[PDB]
Scaffold this motif. Structure first.
Motif: not given
Lengths: 90, 90, 90, 90, 90
Positions: D41-42, D66, D70, D72, E41, E43, E66, E70, E72
């Motif tokens: 997710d870069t 953004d 999501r 991951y 993640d 940026k 941002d 999310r 992770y």
């Protein structure tokens, strides 16, 4: 006297992915780009438009809807296995 | 007298991913870009637009909707396994 | 007398990821970029626009909506395993 | 008399990630960029815009939302395991 | 007489992450950038804009939201394990 010995003797039953390289606008020269390349759902929209693509007067609307129900189910990607049970079930 | 011995003798059953390299606008030269490259859902929108892409007068609207129900389920990525049970179930 | 011995003798059953390298606008030369590269959901929007992309008069609206229900479920990434049970279940 | 011995004898069943390197605008030369690179997710928005991208008169609105649901879920990232039970469950 | 012995004899079943390096605008030369690099993640918004990107008259509004739900969940990151139970459950 360059000498490259790779995987000389293999008695067993392996699962191998070998790659032996031995050497002695957008311009690319003298390269090896992708050997085991896996690109899944990759997208490029505007790449290398020509010289002066919108020179004098441009009214450009760029709408890029990336919006879909998608299912990528890869049980083993770039990954060998000697003895195994690899399964995707539903 | 360059000499590279990789994985000389393997009796067993392995799962291997070998890569042996032995050497003696956007311009790229004399390289090895991607060998085991896995790119999943990668996107590039505007790359390497030409010389003077919007020179004098431009009214550019760039809307990029990255919005979708997506499911990437990879049970083993770039990861070998000798004896194993790899499973994706639902 | 350069000599590189990697993984000379392997009796057992391993899971290996070998990489042996032996050596003797945006310009890149004489390199090795990505060998085991895993890029998941990577995005690049405006990279390497040309010489003078918006020179004299520009009204640019750059709206980038990164907004989606996404599910990346990777049970083993760049990680080999000899004896194991790797599972993604639902 | 450069000599590099890595992982000479392995009787057992390991899970290994070897990397043996032996050596004797934006410009990059003579390098090794990413070997085991995992980018999740870069994002890069404006990288290496050309010479004089907005020279004389520019009205630039850069809005970068953004904002997305999501998930991951990576059970083992860049981490090998010999004997193990690696599981992602729901 | 440079001599590097790494991991000469391994009877057992380990989980290893080896990296043996033996040597004898933005410009980078003669380097090794990232070997086991994990970027989650990450940026970068405006990197390496060209020569004189907003030279004479610029009305730039840079809004960077941002803002997203999310998740992770990484059970083992850059961390090998010999005998173990690694689990992410819900």
């Amino acid at each position: 006297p360059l000498m490259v010995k790779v995987l000389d003797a293999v008695r067993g039953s392996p699962a191998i992915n070998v790659a032996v390289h031995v050497f002695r606008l957008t311009t690319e020269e003298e390269f090896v780009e992708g050997i085991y390349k896996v690109e899944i759902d990759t997208k490029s929209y505007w790449k290398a438009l020509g010289i002066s693509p919108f020179h004098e007067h441009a009214e450009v609307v760029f709408t890029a809807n990336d919006s879909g129900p998608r299912r990528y189910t890869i049980a083993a990607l770039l990954s060998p296995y000697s003895y195994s049970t690899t399964a995707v079930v539903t």
